[PDB]
Amino acid sequence: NPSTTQARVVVDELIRGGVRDVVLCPGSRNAPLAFALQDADRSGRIRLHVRIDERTAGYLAIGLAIGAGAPVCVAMTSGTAVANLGPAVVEANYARVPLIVLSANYFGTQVRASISLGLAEDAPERTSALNATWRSATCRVLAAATGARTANAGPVHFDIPLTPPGRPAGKPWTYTPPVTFDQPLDIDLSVDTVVISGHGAGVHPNLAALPTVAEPTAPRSGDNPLHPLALPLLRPQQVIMLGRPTLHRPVSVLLADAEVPVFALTTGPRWPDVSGNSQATGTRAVTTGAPRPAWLDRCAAMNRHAIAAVREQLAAHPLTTGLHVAAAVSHALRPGDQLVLGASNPVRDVALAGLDTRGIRVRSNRGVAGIDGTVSTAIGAALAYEGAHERTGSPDSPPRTIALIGDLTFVHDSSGLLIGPTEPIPRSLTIVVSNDNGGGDVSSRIFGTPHDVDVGALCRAYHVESRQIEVDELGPTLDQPGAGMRVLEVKADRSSLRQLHAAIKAAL
Amino acid sequence: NPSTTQARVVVDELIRGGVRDVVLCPGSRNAPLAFALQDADRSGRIRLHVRIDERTAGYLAIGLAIGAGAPVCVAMTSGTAVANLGPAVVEANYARVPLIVLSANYFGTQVRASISLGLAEDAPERTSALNATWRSATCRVLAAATGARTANAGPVHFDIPLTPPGRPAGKPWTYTPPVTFDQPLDIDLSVDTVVISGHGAGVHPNLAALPTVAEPTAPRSGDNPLHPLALPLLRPQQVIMLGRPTLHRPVSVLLADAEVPVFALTTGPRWPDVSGNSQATGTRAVTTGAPRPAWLDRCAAMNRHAIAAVREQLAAHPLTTGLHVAAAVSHALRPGDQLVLGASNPVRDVALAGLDTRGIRVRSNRGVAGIDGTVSTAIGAALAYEGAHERTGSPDSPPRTIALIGDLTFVHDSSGLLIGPTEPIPRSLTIVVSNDNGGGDVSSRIFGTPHDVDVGALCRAYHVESRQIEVDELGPTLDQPGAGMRVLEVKADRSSLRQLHAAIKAAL
Amino acid sequence: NPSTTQARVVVDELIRGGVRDVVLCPGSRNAPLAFALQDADRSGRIRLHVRIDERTAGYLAIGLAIGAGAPVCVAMTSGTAVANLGPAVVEANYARVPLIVLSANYFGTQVRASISLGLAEDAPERTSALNATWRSATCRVLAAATGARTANAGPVHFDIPLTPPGRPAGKPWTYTPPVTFDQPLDIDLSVDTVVISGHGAGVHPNLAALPTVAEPTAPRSGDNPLHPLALPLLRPQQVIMLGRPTLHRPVSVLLADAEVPVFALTTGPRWPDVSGNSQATGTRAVTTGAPRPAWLDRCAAMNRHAIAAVREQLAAHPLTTGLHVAAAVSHALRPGDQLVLGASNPVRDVALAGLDTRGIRVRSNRGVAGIDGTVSTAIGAALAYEGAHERTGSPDSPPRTIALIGDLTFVHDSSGLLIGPTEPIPRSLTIVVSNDNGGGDVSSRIFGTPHDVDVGALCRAYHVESRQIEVDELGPTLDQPGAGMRVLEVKADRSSLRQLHAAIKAAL
Amino acid sequence: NPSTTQARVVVDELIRGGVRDVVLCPGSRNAPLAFALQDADRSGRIRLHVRIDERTAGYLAIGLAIGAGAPVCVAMTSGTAVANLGPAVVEANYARVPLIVLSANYFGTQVRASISLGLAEDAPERTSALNATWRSATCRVLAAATGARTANAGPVHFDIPLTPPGRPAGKPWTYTPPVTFDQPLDIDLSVDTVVISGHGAGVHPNLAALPTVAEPTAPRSGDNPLHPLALPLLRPQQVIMLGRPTLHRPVSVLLADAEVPVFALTTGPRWPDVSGNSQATGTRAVTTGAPRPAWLDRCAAMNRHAIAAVREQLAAHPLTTGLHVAAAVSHALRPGDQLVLGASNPVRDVALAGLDTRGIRVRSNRGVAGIDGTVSTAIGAALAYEGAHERTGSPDSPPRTIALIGDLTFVHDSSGLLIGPTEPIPRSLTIVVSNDNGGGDVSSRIFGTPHDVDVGALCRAYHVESRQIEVDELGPTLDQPGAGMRVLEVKADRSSLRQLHAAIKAAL
């Protein structure tokens, strides 16, 4: 009964801290906060999501967090629960995702904090102090997860071993104002500069005019794009690196060039990543000078050249490839869309196809870039994005969430489609499966051979709408009404990829 | 190149230590020992198994280890690899499975040892000493995994950071003889005694005549069975507990009875588990006296009564339940079979149905009892068991491996069926899926509702033979020829389970 | 030889990062960076300090860090080295001290980072990239230790497993500008407010007029002191807590009062500590209103009352107590002094005696408040403070470092006085030992009995100047010339302490 | 109050498990089991030892454990307590010492087990089950510490977070019989064999006739000694290694000779240590054949030669060296003595001087071989050895405990002499301090210079009897009556050591 009083206080404070979604798995033991959780679900203060696979649950929670930017909880209930959530916790660490893991008695350094509540004790004499202690600890967990004081969001472990009021007007027990992390850096823009924008990059208005190689998940500061294929054809004297870029081969080459100084600008304190020649680190630039017009003209000309080369070789290729599918999805997007990209080929293919990400919410598990949970991540991101839209009060249909994943990723996370009728289901999620039987050392011997999985039969097993579509129909079909969740499968060829990429190189 | 010399030495010593199967996943980085591994595969000294899902790989390796009792390696190649192998490592710890995890730079206390090789250095002057160092370290890993000196087998982490001969006649570099762990315990059998035999129990000839409640995975010392339903109807004055029993409600009740002394006999040193009233611990019994004939008569009569009650209520029930399926499988078994049981309902249902396990190799992930990887465990156990049979030189068809799993377990580990044509596939594995849409706190709300997954469509997606069969046809169908892997689905009712179990209680 | 090239690069970058002092112990194995270290010592770029006791070495390094605010390294060389440095690492964590621990192959969560260099490899082809990699990693360690990006200084573990130029003009390889951590908090000063200033507090000009209970190590923002004995006699409606206050019983009472809202202002992001009723957290206050004159008058009157009570009962007491010694030291201080306080009685006694800390550098290991290493901390702080003074170029005698410790602390850290003639020794360190045979549960049974250690004989054993002095001579003797290190022992009574504190309470 | 019931049960079960001595430090918090502990002390069931230095406490506990072979507890009470006990825990791990660390809420892999009790709950309804649970957990801790089932004794962490009867006749709750760990190994003694006996070696009657190089702490199986200086002058074809030998340079050379097969015989399961050419491992030998008489004659002649060379160069040397002191102590010993050796020079010097260890209990912290706590180890070993003698009922004076340590070790652990009048003090401990100002890389620069500590003044500070004695008076003085604890200081020369060792080599 006191463990009941404690749980209701914790759940109430989590709700006050912005937690709207909680993920739960059936377990050997009663869940932490379980009766308090479904009571909050019954009263509409949160919504529970139940999954059987604990690894699935973590990636669902990741999607629920990245879809609208809120902290999300997962509650553990079994002897396999810690181990099964490992992968999502690693992703949440590297991608700085506010994932709160609830336990009721091992994650080591992956979490921002590991905090255990005191057991609930029968003592009406000090209900005031227990209530303050519990809500203060909950705000501690929330702050560590959201990076409210550290500007370094990430997963937190919150153990509760197994109703007094919170603050007035639904306020959090301990309020933490917006924190401003400032580290200004002098940069002279007259030196030939390229901006490399990676995962987690901030927005820099004073850099908007510079040639920018932006990863799909990086927000764009301006409108002077530089295609990644143009970069090896250029000789920048200076590089401004935003966030953590990892995608492109020519970026890794350039960032490792001791001849070229790199200025790393991050939104948080975590150390510049992949360049050993970082000259300095900061959060923003204090600029002098301006780029040479000849430098801008040369970069803009190289961008158009690289863009034309990819677009023309795609158009002239006789077979639909995964790159054609990525280009088709990119062309079909429009402001308001949420795009969820598999961390392998989709994110790279969309970058090579030259996606204009302005107006688009692009999500990809670029933290550790596994294919695990991509389906559940897309489902979670759709649910969280649609929930934010409904909260707006707009009468419109929910915004589209479009996921692009390969067949290997889809088949290995297909169990993420198993959602009970008792559970929330997206209203406007379309998963585009680029099916070529492949990926992208003896382990590669499986890639040389098709898995030959019947994707349509797989979707029918889960009673998810599936349609086999040609790449030219993808755009129109993405506008067509259908089930709240549906899979659009596009057959793609893998045998002509070397021919296609050789044609691109021959056109450059 | 020196890192190549090191890898070939390590792989050769692993082979000398009894490693026949190695599991590998495609990864961001080159695999540890990878070129040495496939070279050993090419020369037939081992066989590689490639999987994409790293969690799948671990449970496949578990099955490959428990099928014939040999040490098995898994080689890690990605940033998601440590986290994805957590669950299988926990199982290997609690089930004492010799699972060797290979890395090339976090498992904490789950492993018996965490050993890192020295980097391979260019130094022909001391090839003799490097070779001795590497092979000695490999025997260290092997011994820790197999419990060669500790009698406590389990997982080991072996890091190799990235050809000189071993001993003559294929011998291991450092030989470890059979270790005999002896802890004799005086027990007077004249006191009314019941034997409770759990997972990991040893064989005790001097206890064979006693009434024994044996879990399906426990080896039988004798032929005086006591059905678990008979136990609450009896008043033993003394309990001899073998291994780690966890299955039965009346066993937990009895083992927790402070009035009843418990003598724990284990094959290894790990501490008596679930009884707080363990009077003593040992490895074997030094017995005096003999059980009263009246005690044996009473236990044997209670056993027949409990057996008759379950069998009669099953026969009279109008609908096929999961218990009917478990009873059908048990009746179809014969000496030489390997039985693989899902860790939830199957192991309990087979126990309630009264399976005679003599002559049968019964496997179940009873270490932590998750449903994860049950399909891959069954596949691995079949492959290892059939490989041992082929090594025997017998011209016979391979022995049958029969797995019994629920539909929930099958659907959540169905991706274990995704095996490339380049990979080993069992010859005589039949997975029996007891499909009732259920399992066995708000998380349970999904159990009240069917998943409604089309299991036949799921198997067709993976191109695995599937047949929908009635429980009376199960026995004959299990004898029928088919694909090397096949699924037999038996539809079962979940709505009449309370009626069925009330009928059992009313007959007791 | 390559491991030599690596070490010289690391040491050079550490020097560029502000490391002036390195602590070293003789060990089973060659020290990390050892030949590079003494070469830097020979060229005057750093100075090495050699100690035999590894725990002593850590506290010496702490003092060397807190004396002038610089990062300090300790280099490990034995199988006892990790365990022996534990206590200083815990202190460095809680006190946010930039302590860099160097190893050459376990500290867990106590360190800000655990970073291992790559082994030095023979490869002139990429000396440019190795040099950038090593110096970048060193700046990473330095930044984590100093909190250059996190504003959360602390210990770091830096493993180097066992000359290319750095930046021009001695600059660090990766520059990190001053980081500004900002979290403004609205506070209305018209509400009756008291400021509680603890260890690690910042300076707040807009709070200078408020009644402030400041711990001895807290910097003073203003000149409106409130004696801690006055606090229970007052009824503040609001508390502004700066830093982490832990000292005073009435502070813990007030901070735990649910009726009183607490606003926590910290210089870094670490979470408000000892109050469960923290209403909000920030880094600075945005104030409105002003304190009532009646509130200021009442607090100032209560302060004078509490001050007079302590001073008068001390003057009238017939025996010298530890409190008399603390008051004598406080009265003898003057701007420019460094005061080092034992973490037990000295810091509390100096607070009760009402020390005016303006102009004084007050150090105390208030992180975890052990008595371990207080002598070596004082020695290290003196050496670092005097080294900063010499760098100034002032012809004056070095500033005084005065340490106040109890006899128990002195005897248990007396081996810190063992400094070889080959090692740096302070020029103006005076350790005042308040000797009453006591401290301040069956463990307390030793306090009831004197240790009876001859402190003078103890100092003579270490050939440290020692003088037995009466409390009235302490001030004049602290001005008298003597050895660079000397101990002034003041005999104090412990039997009349209850009488003295009862007299204080009777005067309040 | 329930936390009181729990503590009394735990302490009672610890006493039933053989715990006679408990070590305690005054702390920030109430000690775990504290009131139960002193109550057991008051009733004479245990004796408490109070120390202020937590590192001192651990080494005192080590000595209390190795003196008579019993499990010993240490109870932690402060925020510095975990870190300060690290070094003793490492020693206990490597030396396999049954050290039980009690906490009341981080040691990682150093401990055999980390076990936390359930909080004491107010529930008379199940006092029977709580009592069984607590006593069972205590026997679990005890068994893990003593290696009762694992034959691998070591430290254990036992957390109790903060009277029902145990078994009849003072028996332990869960009894664990003597465990026999058996791993027989075939060895042919006709091959030229030498036995190398190290720390932790067992006794092997069937090996007693073989030439044996025994470390001082190794028990002797026979009477055919081989001086370590004779080993490089011989060419054994086979080596039987007992325990973990680490002392001698020529042993490390021989054990690393790939040409020579090594058979490792250990009393427990831990893996053969320092030889990479271990051919096999076991616990005992099954022998065939017999050594050649010519081989025995050659080894015996080489032993006499090496013995004569050391003895003659010592006798002819003009100055007393540390080796002379070690030889003087060895010659003064007699059956019944306990010898405690500093882990640096003393253990090696006594080996070089050729000590006959038959009848002698030789202790040395050879686990990690630090000098820390050698004084407190000697004190603890004396107290435990004398307590066993008193339990025998013999009217004789207690047996002598003689410690041999260098001046560096004595000065750095001199605070171990600080023992309150409230605490147990040995009756017959004599510490012999071999004082030459030295030990045995820039860290060595302190060895070239004397510390010049006045050891006599140091002892007077602690009011420990100290006498400055010439090496020829050591034997007679060791027989002379004195205080229960006394220090005998022998001045030794360090400048003529190279001359002395060159004279030894010139005589070989």
Curated annotation (Swiss-Prot), chains A, B, C, D:
Pfam families: TPP_enzyme_N. Its cofactor is Mg(2+); Mn(2+); thiamine diphosphate. The keyword Magnesium applies. SUPFAM superfamilies: Thiamin diphosphate-binding fold (THDP-binding). Keywords: Magnesium, Manganese, Menaquinone biosynthesis, Metal-binding, Thiamine pyrophosphate, Transferase. Its EC number is 2.2.1.9. Binds 1 thiamine pyrophosphate per subunit. One of its GO terms (cellular component) is plasma membrane. GO terms for biological process: menaquinone biosynthetic process. Pathway: Quinol/quinone metabolism; 1,4-dihydroxy-2-naphthoate biosynthesis; 1,4-dihydroxy-2-naphthoate from chorismate: step 2/7; Quinol/quinone metabolism; menaquinone biosynthesis. One of its GO terms (molecular function) is 2-succinyl-5-enolpyruvyl-6-hydroxy-3-cyclohexene-1-carboxylic-acid synthase activity. It catalyses: isochorismate + 2-oxoglutarate + H(+) = 5-enolpyruvoyl-6-hydroxy-2-succinyl-cyclohex-3-ene-1-carboxylate + CO2. PANTHER family: 2-SUCCINYL-5-ENOLPYRUVYL-6-HYDROXY-3-CYCLOHEXENE-1-CARBOXYLATE SYNTHASE (PTHR42916), PROTEIN PHYLLO, CHLOROPLASTIC (PTHR42916:SF1). Homodimer. This is 2-succinyl-5-enolpyruvyl-6-hydroxy-3-cyclohexene-1-carboxylate synthase. The gene is menD.
